Design a protein around this ligand. Sequence first.
Ligand SMILES: CC(C)CCC[C@@H](C)[C@H]1CC[C@H]2[C@@H]3CC=C4C[C@@H](O)CC[C@]4(C)[C@H]3CC[C@]12C
Ligand SMILES: CC(C)CCC[C@@H](C)[C@H]1CC[C@H]2[C@@H]3CC=C4C[C@@H](O)CC[C@]4(C)[C@H]3CC[C@]12C
Ligand SMILES: CC(C)CCC[C@@H](C)[C@H]1CC[C@H]2[C@@H]3CC=C4C[C@@H](O)CC[C@]4(C)[C@H]3CC[C@]12C
Ligand SMILES: OC[C@H]1O[C@H](O[C@H]2[C@H](O)[C@@H](O)[C@H](O)O[C@@H]2CO)[C@H](O)[C@@H](O)[C@@H]1O
Ligand SMILES: CC(C)NC[C@H](O)COc1cccc2[nH]c3ccccc3c12
Ligand SMILES: *C(=O)CCCCCCCCCCCCCCC
Length: 442
Amino acid sequence: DEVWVVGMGIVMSLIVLAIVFGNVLVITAIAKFERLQTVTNYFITSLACADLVMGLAVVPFGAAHILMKMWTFGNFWCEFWTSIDVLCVTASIETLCVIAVDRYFAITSPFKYQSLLTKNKARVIILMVWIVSGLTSFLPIQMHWYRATHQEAINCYAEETCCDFFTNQAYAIASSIVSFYVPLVIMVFVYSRVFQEAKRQLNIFEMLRIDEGLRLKIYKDTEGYYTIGIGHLLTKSPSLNAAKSELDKAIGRNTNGVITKDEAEKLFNQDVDAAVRGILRNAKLKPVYDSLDAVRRAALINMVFQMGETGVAGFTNSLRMLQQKRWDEAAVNLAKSRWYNQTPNRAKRVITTFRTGTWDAYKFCLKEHKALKTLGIIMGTFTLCWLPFFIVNIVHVIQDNLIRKEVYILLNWIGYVNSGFNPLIYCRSPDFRIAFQELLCL
Ligand SMILES: CC(C)CCC[C@@H](C)[C@H]1CC[C@H]2[C@@H]3CC=C4C[C@@H](O)CC[C@]4(C)[C@H]3CC[C@]12C
Ligand SMILES: CC(C)CCC[C@@H](C)[C@H]1CC[C@H]2[C@@H]3CC=C4C[C@@H](O)CC[C@]4(C)[C@H]3CC[C@]12C
Ligand SMILES: CC(C)CCC[C@@H](C)[C@H]1CC[C@H]2[C@@H]3CC=C4C[C@@H](O)CC[C@]4(C)[C@H]3CC[C@]12C
Ligand SMILES: OC[C@H]1O[C@H](O[C@H]2[C@H](O)[C@@H](O)[C@H](O)O[C@@H]2CO)[C@H](O)[C@@H](O)[C@@H]1O
Ligand SMILES: CC(C)NC[C@H](O)COc1cccc2[nH]c3ccccc3c12
Ligand SMILES: *C(=O)CCCCCCCCCCCCCCC
């Protein structure tokens, strides 16, 4: 009973520690490593700063309030502490909203995956975000627009040991809509179209990129022959210069064995043309290919890339079942191949593609798409932590006191605790994980 408040104190103290530690680690990693200095990571800094202020200025005094069962920091700090609280929550959802919009234009840009913003313009945005949040949060609280007019609230306002957030319904509705719901709805809508667009960008180039790997330097394939890009054979000759000679010939310049990713895509597309042509000539492969849809045509091409035409024509039973759109039966047979035994992961995705006729097997495989997922998790996690609390806001406007006071406080703390989640989610990123490892004397 009094023992538990020490124990509750310990837990809340660990929460405060976790928020401050992780977010300082995030802020440090971005500031210290030049690799992590992207426009996206500038917003992550704004997001991490808001969470940090929560862990320092907001959460500790909220904890003391609950443990001590009263406000011991006076009326001025109460209004100020309340203003900071609201600001940080407003700033976070606005920043998240900016990231989603930024990511949208980056992915729909001809110059792909980089922002339409210079590093300075991005900073201006961040500053503007904090200012708008400040205007939205600090102004109404210090102007006393939020206050309710009934007596009980007036007692609490006047009382120096009472810090309760009593509000008039006009504020409760308008504030929670402008601060939270509006940037929420935008963020959810916009980023959902970010996902669609990323899913759109999956094609045979990405498929072979994932299944085979893209090499910018001249390398030797398993057979010892010189190759480059996505399994593009340059020459069977043992001389390197000839492979370079062949490469320069195909590319159209002096490469010295190194090409760009886009040049590799030219070569790959160049190869695909030959791969399709050979398939249409092959008597055993043409009927299957004619019958197949575009997606499954890519899966077959993927196999011809790996095995050659002769190898693929070996699956006589699987080919006939594919031709008859008996996908599952074709999958059972393809699983029993030498091909599945040697490279099971690649075979699994190709076979799965044959089953569904979709790209749902080459999904969040690209490093860039995994990054989009991490940002998705950040947004989702925030939504789920704060939405219940913010629903109750509106619920009590309709009909007040519908929900117990301890429940409302608890939901707020689920919202508070969110500030500690983001640094942990960033460990999904390989770059952040490596940045963290260096920073922790590991
Ligand atoms: C309102 C009081 C209590 C807290 C002040 C809010 C602070 C944390 C806000 C105010 C202006 C913000 C910044 C505005 C400009 C940028 C530049 C960018 O490269 C990193 C983030 C950064 C630096 C912002 C995050 C942190 C920031 C400094
Ligand atoms: C206002 C009280 C309650 C909290 C203290 C605010 C501190 C933690 C905030 C306010 C201004 C912030 C900074 C503003 C400028 C940037 C530059 C950026 O490249 C790294 C983070 C950094 C250095 C911020 C980190 C922390 C920071 C110093
Ligand atoms: C009031 C309470 C929350 C203050 C607690 C401050 C703690 C969280 C601060 C104070 C000193 C900080 C550390 C100082 C030493 C380093 C090494 C650096 O390369 C990365 C950050 C790191 C690991 C800091 C992490 C957190 C840290 C331990
Ligand atoms: O057989 C047609 C394609 O073969 C090469 O690419 C293969 C390579 O032979 C093989 O060692 C490896 O396992 O797979 C790659 C592709 O996944 C050619 O040089 C391509 O241009 C041909 O289309
Ligand atoms: C202990 C209390 C003070 N903490 C409130 C939440 O942490 C933050 O709640 C909000 C954040 C941003 C805008 C907001 N408008 C509101 C209207 C009513 C209640 C909370 C909020 C609110
Ligand atoms: C490598 O980066 C890991 C070793 C870093 C050790 C730094 C020691 C920090 C001591 C923290 C004590 C501060 C407590 C502050 C409480 C208010």
